[model samples]
Target chain A: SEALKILNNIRTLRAQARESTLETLEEMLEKLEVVVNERREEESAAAAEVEERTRKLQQYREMLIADGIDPNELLNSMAAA
Target chain B: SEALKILNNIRTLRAQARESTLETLEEMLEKLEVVVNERREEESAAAAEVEERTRKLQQYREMLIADGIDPNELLNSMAAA
Candidate 1:
């Protein structure tokens, strides 16, 4: 029970962090709207989107690193789990 | 144009710091949600909540310090700005 509960909570927190990371990236992108509008708005928007996605991806990588896991390997494991 | 651009960016970043401070607080709150969901939630929540809010309040206080502005005075001025 202890192990199960702990795993559940850990997964939940990981999920929450992942979700929050996305939200934070969204806010960051919104802040960049002005900068993006200055030049090619469409190009800027696309670049901003990539940046946000990359940032969130890096956050998950950091989480994996914190757990002493290789992020790429963990991603594979997560898929198989 | 140059002077105006500088002032505009300065104001923009200031507004940004203010807004980011709020977003950071909200993220901190989301992280605290799980702890609050426990049965002993209320009381544990208060002390941590105070600690967190105070922490963010201190963040803005630091930003003010960084800008060589008095936090209390500027908050008052901001009300009038």
Candidate 2:
């Protein structure tokens, strides 16, 4: 290759490195979307589990109150003592 | 102003819109950072709630098992029936 052509090729490569293409930007954005999706998945699952446990806790506490052994009262009395 | 100066000002404004400055890019990046932080906040709270509820569930289940009523067995039999 001619000396000028080789130098121009290097310049092109350097310029390519200096300025990213849209495809490159899209690749990074896609990666971020994956991370965002992961966060949403965890958020949804955790929120569901919390609601489920809360409802079950309410059911059990009501059952305890029916059995004349309210855990709230027991805990309050224990704490006061 | 001279006609040439007015034309040059328009050209400069067009170029400014065409090629964003570093500050402009940083402003967009900062917006993305805010979104990412929001995702992380939800992620952290969700994961914490999941763990907290899981531990509590295990604690209660073990207590039930200690009282000769294993939830695992009850759930399995209920499902089978």
Candidate 3:
């Protein structure tokens, strides 16, 4: 029962973490879009913010891709993964 | 000088946080690689583990991608960004 319990717990935690991470990613993406649009409006400061945030996002994305997870598919695979 | 001090701290914190995030992403990538290699050896059980970890990584990656971060470019731009 202990082994089964541990596996179940792992599954639950993994699911939750996956969901939360996906949600965070979606929010970050929108924020990035806003920065880009603002930059389009010729806001130099907003452009800088976009660069800064995008840089951070790049680090996160590379980790996921290098790990073999299809970053593009993450949103759709929420239930399957 | 308070304005300067806050700006300096913000810059420092942003830099550190960026680096830390990069480091964390790197570690996750390494771990995922291990799982993949282990699975290559025909460890079916290890395959399941890889799936779980990779799924989480994927979520992280999507968030990054959505944020308009180029995953492949991050490693190269570390010093410049």
Candidate 1 error regions (>4 Å): A1-81, B1-39
Best of the two (1, 3) by TM-score = 3
By TM-score, the best candidate is 2
Ranking by DockQ: 3, 2, 1
The 10-residue segment with the lowest total lDDT in model 3 chain B: B72-81
Which pairs clash (backbone N, Cα, C closer than 3 Å) in model 1? none
Best candidate per lDDT, number? 3
In lDDT terms, how accurate is model 1?
0.55
How good is the docking of model 3, as DockQ? Answer: 0.01
RMSD of 1: 37.0
Q: lDDT of all the models against the reference?
A: 0.55, 0.60, 0.62
Q: Give the lDDT of residue B71 in candidate 1.
A: 37
Residues B1-81, candidate 2, lDDT per residue (tens digit)? 664464358666566556887788679769978998999999998998767644554555555456445444343332332
Tens-place lDDT per residue, model 1, A6-47, is 535866656655766777857866876666676677787899
Interface RMSD of 2: 11.8
User: Which residues of candidate 2, in runs, are more than 4 Å off?
Assistant: A1-81, B1-18, B72-81
Question: Candidate 2 — which pairs collide?
Answer: none
All models, RMSD in angstroms = 37.0, 42.0, 35.6
Q: After superposition, how far is residue A77 of candidate 3 from its true place, in Å?
A: 2.5
TM-scores for the candidates: 0.25, 0.33, 0.27
